[model samples]
Target: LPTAQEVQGLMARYIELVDVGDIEAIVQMYADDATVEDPFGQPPIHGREQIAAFYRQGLGKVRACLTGPVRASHNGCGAMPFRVEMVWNGQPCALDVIDVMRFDEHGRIQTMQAYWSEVNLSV
Candidate 1:
């Protein structure tokens, strides 16, 4: 397990990559066998190939921010609440989100499960 500050800094890097729309760089932060679910209750995407494509789908369509503090556990787990702003149908929208990331022994993200809902969506 890493320090909370370390994990939080890692998340900050993640958000930085997100803001730049660097799908390749962002996906490279994960382990080869990582899984991702960008919104809760959806079928989680498994593996790096799929995860890269998943993020690719959103590249250039959104901007993200760390809306609140990040919390980390002693067991390679961290959670960050964030907001994603974007324009849809020419209208600005904000989507509140929380991502639970589990890190591997090497500190690469192993799994990232996002939690959000239509209720968190605003315009």
Candidate 2:
């Protein structure tokens, strides 16, 4: 298991990429063949290109998005996972998100799962 502070910093790096619209950095965080399952949409997505594309879809629609790092520890059974809570804007939407990231023995993130909740959507 990684240190809370180290994992927390990784989450911060992710938020930085989002806030700045840094697609390259965002893509760099994942493994070349990483798989991701995001909660807000349908179907499980895999591969770096598709995963990057998914984020691009959202990026194309939003402006001035912000992410506030989770301030509390996430207790899961006996382990505390790295969690982040963020609120973003687009139309009249609000996203409450939890990003769970797991690293390999090489200290590289092998997979990332984002479970999210949104409010006030009708389109």
Highest TM-score against the true fold, candidate: 1
How does candidate 1 fare on TM-score? 0.93
lDDT digits (tens) for residues 22-120 of candidate 1: 998998889988888878689989877888888887774689999988888878889998998988978989999999998888888898999999999
Reference-based lDDT, residue 110, model 2: 66
Candidate 1: clashing pairs of residues = none
Span of ten consecutive residues with least summed lDDT in model 2: 75-84
TM-score of 2: 0.65
For all candidates in order, the CA lDDT equals 0.86, 0.56
95: Cα error in model 2, Å: 1.2
lDDT of 2: 0.56
Q: What is the TM-score of each candidate against the true structure?
A: 0.93, 0.65
Give residue 74's lDDT in candidate 2 (0 to 100).
34
RMSD of 2: 5.5
lDDT for position 80 in model 2: 22
